[PDB]
Structures are given as C-alpha cells and as structure tokens.
Paper text:
The asymmetric unit of the unit cell in our 2.6 Å resolution structure of ∆90 PGAM5 H105A/MM revealed organization of the phosphatase domain into a dodecameric ring, with the MM peptide positioned in the lumen of the ring at the base of each phosphatase domain. The dodecameric ring in the crystal structure of ∆90 PGAM5 H105A/MM has a central six-fold symmetry axis that better matches the C6 symmetry of the 2D class of the ∆48 PGAM5 ring than the C2 symmetry of the ∆54 PGAM5 crystallographic dodecamer. In the ∆90 PGAM5 H105A/MM structure, residues R152, Y108, and H230 adopt similar orientations, but in the absence of phosphate. The on state observed for ∆90 PGAM5 H105A/MM in the absence of bound phosphate underscores the importance of ring assembly for stabilizing the active architecture of the catalytic site. We also observed a notable difference in the conformation of the C-terminal region of the MM between our ∆90 PGAM5 H105A/MM structure and the previously determined ∆54 PGAM5 structure. Although an identical length of the linker is resolved in both, the improved resolution of the ∆90 PGAM5 H105A/MM structure and overall quality of the electron density map in the linker region revealed a register shift in which the positions of R64 and R65 in the ∆54 PGAM5 structure are occupied by R65 and E66 in the ∆90 PGAM5 H105A/MM structure, respectively. In ∆90 PGAM5 H105A/MM, R64 is positioned directly in the center of a dimerization interface mediated by the α3 helices, expanding the network of interactions in this region. The guanidinium group of R64 in monomer 1 is also involved in a previously unobserved cation π-stacking interaction in trans with the phenyl ring of Y198 of the adjacent monomer. Although such structures are not present in the crystal lattice of ∆54 PGAM534, the unit cell of our ∆90 PGAM5 H105A/MM structure reveals rings stacked to form tubular filaments.
Phosphoglycerate mutase family member 5 (PGAM5) is an atypical protein phosphatase implicated in a number of functions within mitochondria, including organelle homeostasis, mitophagy, and cell death. However, unlike most PGAM enzymes, which are phosphotransferases or phosphohydrolases of small metabolites, PGAM5 dephosphorylates protein substrates, targeting phosphorylated serine, threonine, and histidine residues. Between the MTS and phosphatase domain, PGAM5 contains a linker domain with a centrally located “multimerization motif” that potentiates PGAM5 activity.
Residue numbers in the entry:
A (entry chain L): 95 to 110, 114 to 289
B (entry chain X): 56 to 65
C (entry chain K): 94 to 109, 119 to 289
D (entry chain J): 94 to 109, 118 to 186, 191 to 289
E (entry chain I): 94 to 109, 118 to 186, 192 to 289
F (entry chain V), G (entry chain U), H (entry chain W), I (entry chain T), J (entry chain M): 56 to 66
The structure:
C-alpha cells in the first residue's frame, strides 16, 4: 500500500588505514550542503541507515545535525566493495577475484535487504536516507532498475550527491535522480 | 532483457 | 579522438507553451548552467514550442553560445516500455516513426569526439522526457525498453560524458538540486 | 484515409556551398514547370542544407502562398552501403537512421484527417530521394545507387489511400534545355 | 567491353489501332526532344505493333539517317502476375517473350564496340516497366509499381562493367502538361 | 519480392 | 538481394 | 550486459 | 520423366 | 562429489 522513497547519499570527499580515511575539509562542506538540502525538502525521514566506514560515519554525523530526531542505523552490508567485474573493464583499478567473491555477496545482500517494495504491514510512504559509497550505490541502481549489474561502472556519482529511487507498492521502480549535486556551488563538486 | 515483476519476491 | 564530449541533456520546463512556473524553472536552469564555469559549444534544441521557450530563457544566460534547432529531438514514443504502463498506449505507427527518429537523434548526437576535435566540448541538448531517457539507456548500452524506468523533472540537467575511447559515464540524471524544492515538477 | 497523396521529390540544383549560376537557372526551370502543372500544392518541405534552401527559395517564387517547411531529416547522407559498390561506416550508421526516419515520417498513405488529395513538394538531395524511392516501391534499399537523378529533377510518387505506391516519374528534367542539364 | 550503352525506352503515344491526334502530337514532341539532345543515335528498335510503328515513323522524321529496326519481341504483353495484385497462359507466353526482349536488348556493350552508343527503343508500357525492373535487378513482380506516360522517355545506362543506372523514368517534361496522357 | 500491405502501418 | 555482376553473361 | 566498444562506429 | 498435362497452361 | 580446491579463491 505504501511507496518507499530511497535517498542514496555518497560519502563526501575524504582522505585517501581506514580509520585515517576521514573527510577532507571540502568533504565537510559538501556534507554540510547535503544536510541543508535534505532538511530543505520538507520531508519527515524515517531512518538514516549508513555504512560503517569512517567517511560514511562522518558524512552521517554532519547530515544528522540538520535532521534532528531521525533514527540512525549502522550496517556492515553497505561498506564499499567490488560488486562484480565491470564491463567494459577499467584497467587502472582491477580488484582480485577474492574481492569480487566476498564483496559481491555482501553488496547483493545489501541490495536485497534494503531495496524492495514496502512490507504489507507498512503504514505510509516512507522517506529513508542511505549514506554509503560509490560502487555500492551504483550497483544498487543497476539492480533496482534490472539493468545489467556489470554496468555499475557506467555510472558516476559526485561526493555528497543524492540519488533518489522510488519503489511503488506494485514493485515498479523509478529512478527520479542520480548524482544530484545541483545544491552545491560548482567549485565544490568532486568525484574524488 | 525483460522486466521481472517478482524481483523482490513480494 | 582525444577530446571528451560533455552532453548536458535538459528537459523542457513545465508547460500547459510554458507555464509561469516553467519559465521560472528555465530561469533557474540557465543560471545554474552559466554558473558552472564552462564554455559551451552549442545549444541543440528540439523544435517543439516548449523546447524553444526553454531554450529562449536559458540562452539569455549563455549569450554567444551557438543555438541549433532540430526535428530529431522532438518528443515521441521511442519503443514500447518494459514493464508496460497501462495509462499510456500509443499505436504501432507512432513507435514505428518516432523510434526511427529518436534513434537517429541518439546516433547523430551521442558518440565519441571526431578525430579532428582538438579540445573537450561542452554541449547542451534541450529536449524532452522520453527522448532524454531513451538516449540515456542507449548511451549506457542498457536495454532501451527500460527508458520508462527513469523519471526526469522539468528543467532538470542530465550530464553524460563520452571518453575518447568510447566509454560512456552517466555523471548525473534529472539533477534539479539547484531549484527550490517547492518549484520542482515532473508534469 | 480516403485521399491520395502526390509527392514531388525535387533534387537540389547545381552547387559549389551555394548554388552555381546554372543551378539557380535550373531551379527556376523546375519552379516554372511545377507552377505550370495546374496543381494546387499544399506544402513545400525542404532539407535545411544551403543548396536545398536556395533551390526552395527559387521554386517558392513561382508557388506563391504555398507553405514552406524545413527539416534536418531530409539532409543528404549515406543511407546504406550501395550494392554493387566509399564512405566510412560511421556515416552509414548515422545517416541511415536519419534518412529512414525521414522516409517513415513523410512517405505513407494519407492520414485519417486528410479528406482531399494533396500535392506536396519535397526538395532534398540525390541519395535521399533515391533511397526514398527504393523504399516506397519495396525494392531492395541496398540498390538506391542504381538510380540517378539530375539536378533540379522531379520525381513523382503517388501513394493511394490503400497504401499502394506508384512511381509515375523519376528524375524528370525534360523541361530543362539539354545544355542546362547536370548531375553534379 | 569498353563502351557504355545509353538506352532510351520510349512508350508509344496515345492511340485509339492507330495513334489519336493527340498521340501524333505527343510523338512529335518526343521526336523534337530527342533531336534537341545533341546526340548521334545508333538505332531505333521498335515493336511491330501499329502504335509503336506510328510513333517510330513520327520520331524518325526528326532523326533522319538513324537506322530503323522492327522486333516482335518488344510487342506488348503481360510479363508476370504483378505483386501487389489475364489467364495464366498469357503470363506463361508473354513472359518468355518479354524476357527474351530484355535479354537480347538490355546488356553491356559488345567488346568490338569502340565508341559509346545511343539507342532508342520505341515500345509499350508493360514491356518497358518490366525491362526497368530486370535491368535494375529489382523484383520483376513490381513492374506494376511503375507508371509511364505516353511518349515518355526512360533512360538506362549500362557501363562496360555491367553496372546499370536508371537516369530517368517516364520523362515527359518536354510536353505541355495539357498534352500528357497515360491512356 | 512480396508486397507488405502494412509497410506504413496505417492498414 | 545481391547484385549479380554477370547478369548479362558478358563478364 | 556485455559492452560493444564499436557502438558508435568510431573505434 | 512424368508427363505434365498442363504444359501449355490450358488444362 | 568432487572437492573444489579454489572454493575460497585463494590458491
Ligand atoms: Mg564538522
Ligand atoms: Mg565513496
Ligand atoms: Mg518534455
Ligand atoms: Mg543533392
Ligand atoms: Mg545501389
Ligand atoms: Mg503502350
Ligand atoms: Mg511517365
């Protein structure tokens, strides 16, 4: 009966040990802007589910400041990884078969557990924020639209961008926006 | 290349 | 082919010709495009009234960018969507002609840079919802029948990048983050 | 669909990309002929290429009050690899799609809205017209280069309300003095 | 082969039997046109049908000194059942005859022929349309998808490599519109 | 070779 | 629909 | 889902 | 080698 | 019932 609005937010620009892979100052500004935008949409968000990676945790802290009273939830399922071998293959980055073997199962589990039509027990349209990472979100988008998942690398997502998926109670999926950063000043938009 | 209506089994 | 092509597909603003809100939307889209700090090569636009109006408003913020009209980018029915929508059922003749035309648009405008192109290009294509979504599905080599699995707001910016080796990246789809939420529409 | 459509496909006159002096004289001869046919033409659709627009202007001088329309669909191109055989494949890939779109949108039986017979003038280019003709007759399109059209020529297609197609003239330039007939 | 063959297939003018008065006028205009092209014609091959002989005589006055030749092969008939839609025997008989006409008259130049030839073939609607479909290697059953005015000029070019170009079909631009007929 | 009567749809 | 270069048997 | 590198005929 | 009775299209 | 030596992708 309900429709689910899924807002996938990519972590802001960060420093490239994971613990020391924290947001850059520009990343802080980007997350600040994203929080401003989310707060200005006038929506009552149900949850902020976020990856357990440092940069996702920090982007979540900043965004959560603008959405007081929104439940926060941590997940290992949403951590960044290598979902499937991309086609066409990209040569600078080429993970080992083990990374596909592990991360594909984990990220596919994430897609199946979080991307679905509302449960029949659901009362009203939901508005949910998912703060995670580039590869994860791109794979989620390919899977949700039932496009070949090997094409996740055909997408590109700016830091702090908002990707809006809509799942109607009949299971149909609409991608209403991908990589939205129009709310950021152009000089502060990054992909890395 | 054809849409599956039961992708989420729901 | 050494240059990269940046294609900005803009959906026509809200219409009944443009509504008052639609004209405001085109104003916002033009402001954003001009504030990106890019030197645009051309504005290719559908020859439909609302496309001409959106182009007129946007062009004021990008004076001196060549403008081009085309019938190829006019709105139409590219192919039967999958899954079916039972609120919109054009006839076979419409798919037959409009698909040929929209596919011609895709082939003529979406490609890697010509060998003679020396510098990266930034190009604006102002057209329509179905055309843009079909263009997007084809450029990414996704099943075109899924063009209706996408949704585009009025005046939104869709950023496509074509690398000189033929690789295609969808940098953004339906971007309207530059408009006040209360001014965003799909119809 | 109770009306019949008469389609007059005119090839652009000689050009260099403006018309040559001879090309303009050719366009004048074509316009005189069209005006002397004793027909009331509904529209003039023309390619947006320079020479097509110039030939259209010249012809339009003799057809006062006839609606004029420009299209990118009718611009010259390489529709398919001719058989028997040289452009690059990218050109076939782009131009074939566009020329086929032109054919599908402009060559068809009369629409239900059309009650009376129409006479329509299409000013384009050699390859476009020849491809249109091969398609309209349901002849193998790969043979479009087995046809040849002089500059300023008139090709008369008739599409009957039941979808049947008759080619009544192809490449007619008998109205031009032989010393002013050219193919390039 | 070294030379190129230029073939002018001309439909007999309007007739009743013999030519109508308008038919005679049409044949006169066609002869005028051919004489005004500035070509030295090699031969005039014509069907042996009354109307073909009449159009040939009229045209011939304007091209005197051009060899004249008669053929029964070029006589009118029904070559094939057209697609889209005469007893089966007429297709059976006339198809063989018109196919023979096509094979004997439409081909690349003989190797001995040194200079380009320009030949006029005065015959009939069905024969010419079938000839054109065959020469272009288009489906012959589509011969009825073409239409030819009385006295019209159809120009075929056969290059010494056997490739064929159709330059004009049913040309009557040299006639005043009020004198153009198809029957 | 065989005419398609629905070449333009519209049949 | 392949062009036959020997249609007239004179190649 | 397997990419054609000659999709635009400019490879 | 079997005789066709409609050889002349007149059966 | 054959053992896969690369079950964990680490050979
Ligand atoms: Mg902070
Ligand atoms: Mg990330
Ligand atoms: Mg639109
Ligand atoms: Mg031309
Ligand atoms: Mg050809
Ligand atoms: Mg006759
Ligand atoms: Mg004729």
């Amino acid at each position: 009966k309900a429709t689910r609005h899924i807002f996938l937010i990519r972590a802001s620009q960060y420093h490239v040990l994971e613990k020391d892979r924290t947001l850059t100052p520009l990343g802080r500004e980007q997350a600040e802007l994203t929080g401003l935008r989310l707060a200005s949409l006038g929506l009552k968000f149900n949850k902020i589910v976020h990856s357990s990676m440092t940069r996702a945790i920090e982007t979540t802290d900043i965004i959560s400041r603008h959405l007081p009273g929104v439940c926060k939830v941590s997940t290992d399922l949403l951590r960044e990884g290598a979902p499937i071998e991309p086609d066409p293959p990209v040569s600078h980055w080429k993970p080992e078969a083990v990374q596909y073997y592990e991360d594909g199962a984990r990220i596919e589990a994430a897609f199946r557990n979080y991307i679905h039509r509302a449960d029949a027990r659901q009362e009203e349209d939901s508005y949910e924020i998912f703060i995670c990472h580039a590869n994860v979100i791109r794979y989620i988008v390919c899977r949700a639209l039932q496009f070949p998942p090997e094409g996740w690398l055909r997408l590109s997502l700016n830091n702090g961008s908002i990707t809006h998926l809509v799942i109607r109670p009949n299971g149909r999926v609409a991608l209403r926006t991908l990589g939205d950063t129009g709310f950021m000043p152009p000089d502060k938009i990054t992909r890395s | 290349g054809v849409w599956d209506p039961n992708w989420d089994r729901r």
